[PDB]
Amino acid sequence: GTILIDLSPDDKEFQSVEEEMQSTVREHRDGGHAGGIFNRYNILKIQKVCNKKLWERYTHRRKEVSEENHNHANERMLFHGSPFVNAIIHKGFDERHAYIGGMFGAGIYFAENSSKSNQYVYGIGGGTGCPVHKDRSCYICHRQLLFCRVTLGKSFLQFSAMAHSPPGHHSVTGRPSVNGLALAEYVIYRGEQAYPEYLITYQIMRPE
Ligand SMILES: CC(C)(C)c1ccc([C@@H]2NC(=O)c3cccnc3N2)cc1
Ligand SMILES: [Zn+2]
């Protein structure tokens, strides 16, 4: 039941999603090992993901969380990178999209930094890079990220350098405690707490 609607580059909605993508690029401590070496992207396409059933699943859960947290869903727009983006947009987030080995336990991980999500497009640690050239820094191959609506509710704050959320909480917030330039990362433990709103197709750009 999923349809994808192309946004025009002239549309303010395209432009605001592109700006969030581009402006949340940062340098990574691996020197580009996982995600490649780049300062910006070539955005090729932004599509709106429309699925009524998946949307209703999201809003149902959002209301449950809101009602447990003084009518505050604590909703964010966050990036998600995965080899399984095409499964996610069709069937929704579920336990198969969780990172069993992540720093904050087995949940589904989201990032404020688009470049953090870019590290996971080809798998954990960038896997073996693009399927065509086996290059984690491929400048040719088309990559895809999701820009998602995420319900955090009451989030457990972890300071730092599928399971259940901590008792009394709906998510975990991974606050950076060393790298002063990194933005937060977030983990949810219920697939119904995220909706994949935008599918972004892009390339990383080789620095000049
Ligand atoms: C390949 C699997 C399912 C194991 C996977 C997929 C995505 C991610 C995940 N993607 C993110 O965008 C992300 C954002 C912030 C921190 N960690 C992330 N990993 C982890 C693991
Ligand atoms: Zn490639």
Curated annotation (Swiss-Prot):
Task: Look up the domain of life of the source.
Answer: Eukaryota
Question: Which residue intervals define the domain PARP catalytic in the entry?
Answer: 8-208
For binding Zn(2+), which residues are annotated in this chain's numbering? Answer: C130, H133, C138, C141
Q: Where in the cell is it found?
A: Cytoplasm; Golgi apparatus membrane; Nucleus; Chromosome, Telomere
Protein modification: Ubiquitinated at 'Lys-48' and 'Lys-63' by RNF146 when auto-poly-ADP-ribosylated; this leads to degradation. Deubiquitinated by USP25; leading to stabilization.
Expressing tissues: Highly expressed in placenta, skeletal muscle, liver, brain, kidney, heart, thymus, spinal cord, lung, peripheral blood leukocytes, pancreas, lymph nodes, spleen, prostate, testis, ovary, small intestine, colon, mammary gland, breast and breast carcinoma, and in common-type meningioma. Highly expressed in fetal liver, heart and brain.
Which cysteines does the record link by disulfide bonds? none
Q: So what does mutating M103V actually do? A: Loss of activity
Q: Which family does it belong to?
A: Belongs to the ARTD/PARP family.
Q: What does this protein do?
A: Poly-ADP-ribosyltransferase involved in various processes such as Wnt signaling pathway, telomere length and vesicle trafficking. Acts as an activator of the Wnt signaling pathway by mediating poly-ADP-ribosylation of AXIN1 and AXIN2, 2 key components of the beta-catenin destruction complex: poly-ADP-ribosylated target proteins are recognized by RNF146, which mediates their ubiquitination and subsequent degradation. Also mediates poly-ADP-ribosylation of BLZF1 and CASC3, followed by recruitment of RNF146 and subsequent ubiquitination.
Quaternary structure and partners:
Oligomerizes and associates with TNKS. Interacts with the cytoplasmic domain of LNPEP/Otase in SLC2A4/GLUT4-vesicles. Binds to the N-terminus of Grb14 and TRF1 with its ankyrin repeat region. Interacts with HIF1AN. Interacts with RNF146; this interaction leads to ubiquitination and proteasomal degradation. Interacts with NUMA1.
Name of the molecule in the record: Poly [ADP-ribose] polymerase tankyrase-2
Q: Which organism is this entry from?
A: Homo sapiens
Q: Parent protein range shown?
A: 952 to 1161 of 1166
